[PDB]
Design a protein around this ligand. Structure first.
Ligand SMILES: Nc1ncnc2c1ncn2[C@@H]1O[C@H](COP(=O)(O)OP(=O)(O)OP(=O)(O)O)[C@@H](O)[C@H]1O
Ligand SMILES: O=C(O)CCCC[C@@H]1SC[C@@H]2NC(=O)N[C@@H]21
Length: 232
């Protein structure tokens, strides 16, 4: 990742890459989004000062069930930690948190032989909406200073490219350990909802990238990426 397409304002970098045929190793960046979407059509507030970009991957190269989102999440957290010198956490299966507030969201979509990844990073948002204020923060709120969005973008893209290359010729074993230790709510009571309901203690992560939940009837391995993890 080195070549960038930088737009001032657009409906959604995800939507744009659905209509436009871009080559691999190219990231579409937008300063603002009017129709920013989440993992289920939810509104993703994208005001000025934030980082919003999408890129394409080969659906025949990466298995995007659970492993991919975890590696992408690891990548962004590794980049942010190197720049801000602040520790970050990973929410299974696809989000980057600081303490209890979300700082970055990772999204993957498939639209006709296309694997489209969309990452949103809160960096320099000055005014934060109350409806998300309780579960979201920015780099500016944490550190108390602004950060060069382009520099952060390049770092994130470098960590992604490196992690994915090592994910190709090798396996998820190279990341499993690192991710497990950074998992949010590790060893705490949690609840999983969405296409079922499993409750227990988050005891760790499996080799397949599945969540290990200790229930009253033993440890269950959750292999579905539709489950939302909440604190319980
Ligand atoms: N710029 C932003 N930064 C952080 N959070 C945002 C931003 N814009 C929207 N959100 C919130 O993120 C939510 C979408 O995230 P999503 O619903 O995919 O999380 P989830 O994984 O389902 O829930 P959980 O994080 O509890 O597992 C929206 O409900 C919205 O309130
Ligand atoms: O947390 C989530 O639910 C995923 C959020 C993904 C947001 C990014 S920001 C750029 C790209 N375009 C979008 O409409 N969403 C992704």
């Amino acid at each position: 990742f080195k070549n960038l397409i930088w737009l001032k304002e657009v409906d959604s970098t995800q939507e744009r890459l659905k209509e436009w045929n871009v080559s691999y190793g190219t990231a579409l960046v937008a300063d603002r989004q009017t129709k920013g979407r989440g993992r289920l059509g939810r509104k993703w507030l994208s005001q000025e000062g934030g980082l919003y970009f999408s890129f394409l991957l080969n659906p025949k190269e990466f298995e995007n069930l659970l492993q991919l989102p975890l590696v992408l999440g690891l990548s962004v957290s590794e980049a942010l930690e190197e720049i801000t010198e602040i520790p970050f956490s990973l929410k299974w299966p696809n989000d980057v948190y600081f303490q209890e507030k979300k700082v970055s969201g990772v999204l993957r979509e498939l639209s006709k032989d296309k694997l489209i990844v969309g990452i949103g990073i809160n960096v320099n948002q000055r005014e934060i909406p109350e409806e998300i204020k309780d579960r979201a923060t920015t780099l500016y709120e944490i550190t108390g200073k602004d950060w060069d969005r382009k520099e952060v973008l390049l770092k994130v893209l470098k960590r992604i490219s490196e992690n994915l290359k090592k994910f190709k010729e090798k396996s998820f074993k190279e990341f499993k350990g690192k991710i497990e230790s950074k998992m949010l709510y590790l060893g705490e009571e949690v609840k999983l909802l969405g296409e079922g309901k499993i409750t227990g203690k988050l005891v760790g992560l499996s080799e397949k990238g599945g969540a290990l939940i200790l229930t009253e009837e033993g440890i269950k391995e959750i292999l579905s990426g539709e489950f939302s993890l909440r604190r319980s």
